[PDB]
Amino acid sequence: MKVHKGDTVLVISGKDKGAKGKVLVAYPDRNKVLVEGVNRIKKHTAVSGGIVTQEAPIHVSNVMVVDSDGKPTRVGYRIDDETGKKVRIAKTNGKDI
Amino acid sequence: TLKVDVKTPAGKTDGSVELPAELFDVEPNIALMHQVVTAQLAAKRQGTHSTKTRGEVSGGGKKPYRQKGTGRARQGSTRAPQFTGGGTVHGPKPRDYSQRTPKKMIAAALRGALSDRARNDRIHAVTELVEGQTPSTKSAKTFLGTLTENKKVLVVIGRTDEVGAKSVRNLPGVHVISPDQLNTYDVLNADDVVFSVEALNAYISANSK
RNA sequence: GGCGUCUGGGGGGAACGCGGGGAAGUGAAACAUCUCAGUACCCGUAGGAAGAGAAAACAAAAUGUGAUUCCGUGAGUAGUGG
RNA sequence: UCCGGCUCUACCUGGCUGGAGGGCAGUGAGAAAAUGUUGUGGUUAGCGGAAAUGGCUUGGGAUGGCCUGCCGUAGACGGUGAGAGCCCGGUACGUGAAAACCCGACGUCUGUCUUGAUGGUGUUCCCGAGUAGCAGCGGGCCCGUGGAAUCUGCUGUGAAUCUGCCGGGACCACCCGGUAAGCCUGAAUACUUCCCAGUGACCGAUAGCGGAUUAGUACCGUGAGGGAAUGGUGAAAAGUACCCCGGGAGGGGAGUGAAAGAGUACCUGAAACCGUGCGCUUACAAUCCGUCAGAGCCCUCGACGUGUCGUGGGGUGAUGGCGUGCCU
């Protein structure tokens, strides 16, 4: 899906346009991902509830995978025909990311 | 008699064609051209529209209640038009829209159209759009920029010369054609028309005999 | 006929097919002959398609055609018909 | 073509019964089974796949406008917080199958003609029998019993084999064509329960399949059988934490949110219908309920002047005249 948990991303669209972020979880069945520090919502939880500021899911087509060189870059797929993997790869450099 | 200069992508001219007089000095008959394009569009149009009348719907084949004594009106099926769920009456049906325009009216249309463009100097010729056997749309686009500035344009390239087709296909305005299926709507919708020389020769020695 | 063994068949299916049976309201400004229709429906069996199919055929003195089937025309004609 | 033996038999011939090189053909309708190679041949999962975090402004959000670049064998389509060729999914294009399945391809395997043919010459024999034909009732052929052939069904009767027989619209003679009563035969043709991919001058929740919602369900009927209704919050639930009235429902503040004239009875939110306020009018009057004249009061625009007529306009409208709903 060109994003996995543990990757790092750059936000495009929203009030939080221009934000780095770490991916925490993804929801591939609906193309949405919960990035850290973005989409802050003041959820009410009643117990002893409280107005608490939590994350919410971006849609995955509002984030570019940050290049290993620290710039927003696309990603693509070579093959290491020996090992038979399909490595996710930037389309500026060609490196392993 | 109108003359055309072939044109090259590399920035030169090869030769000149001396177009016929009778194909390309016909006077247009606007009613004729109207009729024929209307026919083309009609035959394009497919008749996928059908509805279920009173005799194809579900049920209704029982007189729902008495004729008399009830108080209410008289009814013979629960699927008649005036009900809610009932049959369409005079509905659409799957039908054909083609109409049989003759060969002479058609060809008269096409010749008159090509004349309308020729007199106004919108028929350009060309040997090719490309260098050898490798499509590149940037080439054809630059060449049409050299040769033309209008929005829309027609291209007539034969079957074997697939590279020009594959090249110019993706452009916004262009609408490519083979001269064996040369028609009238596709001509008139345009502003300029780019023939290949093979195409002209085929067209002319196919019609003229 | 009884006993043992071996192989088949048995029923379902949306339409399409071939053989058989087989109406009526309707039209005729009535109606029975006729028509609606050999339709609907029912039966028996199929196949991926079926059935027909190699002249005991056409034709008209033309020195002609050459299995069958399905499409266009002939033709709404020659004709048939209370 | 060579021979093995056979023509009852040893011997000359003619004719069989065997094997052999060979040829032909093959899963054919023309006999039938499996065999193993086998084709980037096809189907049954998929995969890569070009190019802008571009600049100013608006806005909650830019995918908009304007200005700058690029790709293009890819500007088809869709989605993404508002119309996205350059975000995403994917397209043009090229790739891909251990196994199974289908096509042919082969070599097996199987037969099969090979012991043979072209022509000569005068006469006997055979050429599909309860049938064809004829008569009686009937069907269907353009043809309704008519002069009515051909094709046929049941009964009854019932012939010949080539100078034979059947047809050429009664029938007879001549000529013509053809050789029934035994059997198989592909391709063109018709069709879609299901499956795959798309198109639409087709519908867009009283439409479209009866069924966008548990749908042949609920409900009805003993039973066969009938047979409905109900789509939309917003960009994401951030779905109102907390307080006050109340038993609770429900609500008011405080909040979220771009907007709560978006609160899980939620896009917009008409009319009928139900009411609350403000102005005029209405309790001595006979009203298809209106229209023409119009007093009086209230609102308004404008020229002016301490309030005031006007080439005015609008709501009500005392009172007078006229006036017998709409359709078929």
UniProtKB/Swiss-Prot annotation, chain A:
PROSITE patterns per record: RIBOSOMAL_L24
MF GO annotations: rRNA binding; structural constituent of ribosome
Cited CDD domains: KOW_RPL26
Pfam families tied to this protein: KOW, ribosomal_L24
InterPro entries in the cross-refs: KOW (IPR005824), Rib_uL2_dom2 (IPR014722), Ribosomal_uL24 (IPR003256), Ribosomal_uL24_CS (IPR005825), Ribosomal_uL24_KOW (IPR041988), Translation_prot_SH3-like_sf (IPR008991)
Classification via SUPFAM superfamilies: Translation proteins SH3-like domain (SSF50104)
Record's GO cellular component terms: ribonucleoprotein complex; ribosome
Summary of subunit composition and partner proteins: Part of the 50S ribosomal subunit.
Protein name: Large ribosomal subunit protein uL24
Highest classification ranks of the organism: Bacteria, Bacillati, Actinomycetota, Actinomycetes, Mycobacteriales
Curated annotation (Swiss-Prot), chain B:
Region (Disordered): 42-99
A Pfam family this chain is assigned to: Ribosomal_L4
Keyword set includes Transcription: no
GO CC annotations, alphabetized: ribonucleoprotein complex; ribosome
Repeat among keywords: no
Record's keyword terms, sorted: Ribonucleoprotein, Ribosomal protein, RNA-binding, rRNA-binding
GO molecular function: rRNA binding; structural constituent of ribosome
Gene Ontology biological process terms, A to Z: translation
Disulfide bonds: none
Protein purpose: One of the primary rRNA binding proteins, this protein initially binds near the 5'-end of the 23S rRNA. It is important during the early stages of 50S assembly. It makes multiple contacts with different domains of the 23S rRNA in the assembled 50S subunit and ribosome. Forms part of the polypeptide exit tunnel.
Subunit structure: Part of the 50S ribosomal subunit.
Similarity remark: Belongs to the universal ribosomal protein uL4 family.
Record's protein name: Large ribosomal subunit protein uL4
Lineage: Bacteria, Bacillati, Actinomycetota, Actinomycetes, Mycobacteriales
